[PDB]
Amino acid sequence: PNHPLWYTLCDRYGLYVVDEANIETHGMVPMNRLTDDPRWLPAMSERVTRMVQRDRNHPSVIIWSLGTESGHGANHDALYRWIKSVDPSRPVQYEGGGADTTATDIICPMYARVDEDQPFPAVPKWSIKKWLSLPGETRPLILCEYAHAMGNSLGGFAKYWQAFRQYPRLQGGFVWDWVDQSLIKYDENGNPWSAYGGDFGDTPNDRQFCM
Amino acid sequence: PNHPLWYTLCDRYGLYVVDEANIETHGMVPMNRLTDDPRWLPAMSERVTRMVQRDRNHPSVIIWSLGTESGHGANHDALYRWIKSVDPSRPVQYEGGGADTTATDIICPMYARVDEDQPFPAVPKWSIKKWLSLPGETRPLILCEYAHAMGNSLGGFAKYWQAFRQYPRLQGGFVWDWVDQSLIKYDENGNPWSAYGGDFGDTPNDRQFCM
Ligand code: NA
Ligand code: NA
Ligand code: NA
Ligand code: NA
């Protein structure tokens, strides 16, 4: 959840907002070790419920998210239903566990490609055009992350937009991401420069991957 | 419906057969002028019902067809239901009126392309990949006619098969068609040659379009 003024500004300027719970457990092995554990349900519930209670009157918020990169666990299913029960006005999405689980109203993959399948075990990223028509599938598809804009990037961006426009149920996506997470450091002359992972002595670090 | 031996040979050699009623009213304006007319329902019904009564014990027949190129009339809907009621063991398909009407269990377009839409008014031919995931659509897609093999042709044939293999609900199609409808004529020396429309003084005619 963002600084509260963010939603007021999106209300007034007009942007659609996905409001997302402060839950990510990417580094767990496997990713759902905590989110499938009922012992972590109370901590998770407060991150979801206290978000909804704060932001539910903002028109700009059109979709709730259960967080990111936390696999798919029983705690997600419980909290998905809680939101559906408490606020039927907004769809609930969540990408973990393969982007099309029982805890999401929207097929919301990250970096699924337009035409090319990436058939990973358990969590495949299907071609977005293919994903829509898998046997029994009827949901809209909106990528929660695509077109990773790291450095000299956005090659192939036009391919996404051609597909978005051609397929009714391909309803867009959210670029990753808006702003480089570089930080200003100063050299011996007091001149500013842009720093990334490791430039503060931080170790282990993931270098430029924050930009 | 074919010569009765055809089905016996398909049973024994092993080919899946679409058995099709002898109904085509292509030259009508509009195409459904007769098939929407209850006056033509008795004549159409006999073409459907007597086919089923004749061929329903052949294992090679896996799908019934209501005919071809006769638009979509109320008579098709009546006869679709008649088959569903009398023989539940076989799907019913019919292409007329846009390939995805209430008179067909299978989306069965003719010459719909792989990636390119042809948005004709009333009866568009969508890209087959796009067609599958149109809002609310759930049926399999099997082209009743595709890859028109006229003369030096079948360009782009590989494109269909890549898509057939990638998409579960794209379950193939029927090439148009098997054999040139050319006829034998003879020159002054008795040498045979291949003839097409117009070569018999037949007029109006559609020339080489029979091959
Ligand atoms: Na779209
Ligand atoms: Na990053
Ligand atoms: Na297929
Ligand atoms: Na022809």
List of domains in chain B: 1-211 (3.20.20.80)
A148-A150-A151 Cα angle (round to 5): 145
Q: Do A130 and B166 lie within an 8 Å CB cutoff? A: yes
What is the Cα gyration radius of chain B?
19
A163 known ligand binder: no
Task: Judge whether B139 and B107 are in contact, CB under 8 Å.
Answer: yes
Taking each helix axis from N to C end, the angle separating B74-86 and B41-55, rounded to the nearest 10 degrees, works out to 30
Sign of dihedral through CA atoms B121, B123, B128, B132?
positive
Bridge partners, A194 (sequence order): A184
Q: Rounded CA gap, A123 and B64, in Å?
A: 39
CA distance A95 to A150: 21
Any known ligand binding at A26? yes
In a mutational test of the A interface, the residue from B116, B133, B166 whose CB has the highest number of chain A CBs within 10 Å is: B133
Is B22 annotated in some ligand binding site?
A: no
Contact B133 A135 (CB under 8 A): no
Q: Are the Cβ atoms of B129 and A129 closer than 8 angstroms?
A: yes
Distance CA A2, CA A19 (A): 8
Q: Would you list which residues of chain A are within 8 Å, Cβ to Cβ, of chain B? A: 117, 127, 129-130, 132-138, 166-169
Asked whether the beta carbons of A126 and A140 are under 8 A apart, the reply is no
Cross-chain Cβ contact A132/B135 below 8 Å? no
3-state SS, residue B163: helix
Going from the Cα of B112 to the center of ligand 4, the distance in angstroms, rounded, reads: 17
Nearest to A202, CA basis, from A210, A151, A27:
A210
By 3-state DSSP, what share of chain A in percent is helix, strand and coil, each rounded to 5?
A: 30, 20, 55
Rounded CA-CA distance A105/A72 in Å is: 14
Half-sphere exposure of A208 (CA within 13 A, CB side): 5
Distance from CA of A139 to the nearest CA of B (A): 9
What number of C-beta contacts closer than 8 Å exist between A and B?
Answer: 35
Q: Is B200 helix (H, G, I), strand (E, B) or coil?
A: coil
At how many Å resolution was this determined? 2.0
Which ligand sits nearest to residue B180's alpha carbon?
A: 4
Sort strands A192-195 and A183-186 into parallel, antiparallel or unpaired. Answer: antiparallel
CA torsion sign, B18 to B19 to B21 to B25? positive
**Spacing of C-alpha B34 from chain mean position:** 19
Look-up of token digits 């010459």: B111
Instruction: Tell me whether strands B92-93 and A141-146 are parallel, antiparallel or unpaired.
Output: unpaired
The residue with tokens 């009508």 is B28
Cross-strand partners of B18? B63
Residues B208 and B182: beta-carbon distance below 8 Å: no
3-state helix, strand, coil split of chain B in percent (to 5) is: 30, 15, 55
